[PDB]
Amino acid sequence: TDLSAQKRLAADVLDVGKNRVWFNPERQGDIADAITREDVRELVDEGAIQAKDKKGNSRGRARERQKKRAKGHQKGAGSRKGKAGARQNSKEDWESRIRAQRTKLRELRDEGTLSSSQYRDLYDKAGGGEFDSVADLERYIDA
Template identity: 30%
Template sequence: MNLGHKKALASKVLRVGKNRIIFSPEALDQIKEAITKQDIQILHKDGIIRIRPINGRKIVIRIKRKIGPGNIKRNVRDRKQEYVKLTRKLRNYIAFLKGRKVIQQEVYRDLRKKIRARAFKSKNNLKDYLRMIEIDVDNLSPQVKATKVDTKIKKVAPKRKKSKK
């Protein structure tokens, strides 16, 4: 007796896979007569059609796979904009310190490399690092702190002369 169609119908009605459907061998005639979804549900309530339990820890593994830093879906553009904003701020700050001769060229180069490698989370984090390597950033006057170094150089393209024909 081929009951493959009944098994497929039962799996659809009971919302489990075909391999988890178990027919009791004593009542195969009743299963053969079942045509509708309602018949399958009645047979399930009577215990003629059973569902095999899940073995192992598949649910735990499925839950664990969802968690993790690689599965956090954030927009790449947003992360890049954050990075650009922070690096510009920090680079301006160390350029300002270099202009005031608070830091030397070697320290400046080292700091630029660290900023590019995202070693600092914020401007305060950078200041803490500078204090740690014994560079005094606290004694700058309030007026000096407010000024900003303009590091951008605008390139002006030469104007072309229009030829007359």
């Protein structure tokens, strides 16, 4: 018996990789006689032909690590591989910070805490990189 033709057919009918189709060792003779796709579907319905299950990589160990790293662990000098600027894009970080500080000053303005002249002064200072962060900005604001 040579069921290689059928393998090809079952894989298309079951819509699966040929390597996943399973032929019951006790029914080679019958499968051997399967000539048409329909013959195949029929043997499929009798469970003589089935499709093994595809695996997936377990993300269990990945998740635990993900937690430790999200909490601040496993990132010591001994765990870094890329240059600093590689681990965190300096320009990208500046865009983050400067936007925060510009959004902050924007709120205090509308909010009334700052006069369009104080704001202007602070905005310009921020664009000039005078505040390390929003907190630092607020601090400076309070004289």
